[PDB]
Amino acid sequence: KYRVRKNVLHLTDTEKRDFVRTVLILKEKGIYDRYIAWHGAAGKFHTPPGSDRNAAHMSSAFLPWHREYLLRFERDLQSINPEVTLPYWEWETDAQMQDPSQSQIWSADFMGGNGNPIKDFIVDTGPFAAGRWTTIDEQGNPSGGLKRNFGATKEAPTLPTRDDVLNALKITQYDTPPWDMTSQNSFRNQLEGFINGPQLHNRVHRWVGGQMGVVPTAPNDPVFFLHHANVDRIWAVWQIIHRNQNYQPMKNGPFGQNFRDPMYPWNTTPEDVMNHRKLGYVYDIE
Template sequence: MAVRKNQSTLTSTEKREFIDAVLEVKRGGRYDDFVRTHNEFIMGDTDQGERVGHRSPSFLPWHRKFLLEFEQELQRIIPSVTLPYWDWSTDRTAGSSLWATDFLGGDGRSRDGQVMAGPFANLAGNWSIDIQVDTRPFLRRALGGGGRALPTRADIEAVLAVETYDAPPWNSTSRGFRNLLEGWRGVNLHNRVHVWVGGHMATGASPNDPVFWLHHAFIDKLWADWQTRHPASPYLPETPTENVVDLDSTMRPWNDVTPRDMLDHTQFYTFDT
């Protein structure tokens, strides 16, 4: 059984193997397919129209499947690799080990946000931005530039305490665990982290920054934690509902995956804590 670990506990070998696998998926062209898919869905998901990956109840199962497919791509390169998660409630600064040059690299330079060091710096020759939001071919970050601090553990606990998974109108205005975690209202967890990292992470093409996978692996862990705390709270909606994915409807772009299929992460992996 694969175990997803806190990135702060990874050994130097685990870090290197994760990076090597990511770079190889990029070289093979498959990485950009993930970026393209995410960008298409986030641009297409709207509060009043059909929504699948964002602003909707299926935000969590959709991303669980999305991450699982990416993890499987990494494992085709190095079978022992799993997605680490970034606990941004603990590793809260630009000086955290996450941003070291032997792992994800550091902040972007002030004038244009270009990441200058680490394996994903364009200057290293392995990481060109091909699914672009502008014409610049380099990875961009602006750590802390959104003007808000990263969420705290108290913020997380407040969201985990919410018993109802989701509620009408099933969009960015809903009251419920999913929307508070996604960050469209309340203390704002997921969205706030994207803004804090800045650069590509603040765009629909956010998987261009490999930190996307570590951030969403933690979001996935928080969903698993919520499920453990509220075992009697179901995924909602359970029955067909206009414009959103109910429990047993398929989630695009997959033809055979429903939210029900994604409820139990332990069939695929576990977390270290």
């Protein structure tokens, strides 16, 4: 309960500056890249092989995997500066803006802006602009330049709304067989964004575009973490509301998806991260 994760819009200029600086150091040290690889590798780890479930997405472990992922990143941040915490991008309130690109998360001081059409949508403003920040591809080879392309897709022209989130919070079951894309009456699947998708989480990924639009390259953009903090916040609120309702499958699902299964690439199980406050943090709104 001690460490607090705040809304990006509640951050002081100094907090924003320290968050960015710390990410740059993690990047320079070689630590950041381990995060990009972990997520891509988990992306190709199928449970079981032959199915479209993977260790980190399209399945029940989606939520505890990204929560373990964010936890480990935050400790890495804290090992550089013990006061830094992971903030969250509350995209549903940015959804209300006539032009979400004008949200303060996109200023030079922070995430930097949308891609520049003149430069094939390479990001050329902020701390992560090309020349300042290097990217890798799916093979783990250098790839020269962060790209973004807000709302350029007919499948994801807008950010999700507060109503979408509210609507997800009403669902009663964590998850339902067969624990995948096609799971219905499923909070997990609704949040991930496959029900009549792309919605919510999935929708944000494709709204941003650039490297964020595809699983293997998505954490090349530091906003990935800010997005996933918000997702983890939503799940936490859902856990607060539906206090009785627990994780499913508790057993008999695909290995890696059950309550006490190792989540590749780690030994951590969903049980280990089921209650976030036990992990040392709460979100400000708590």
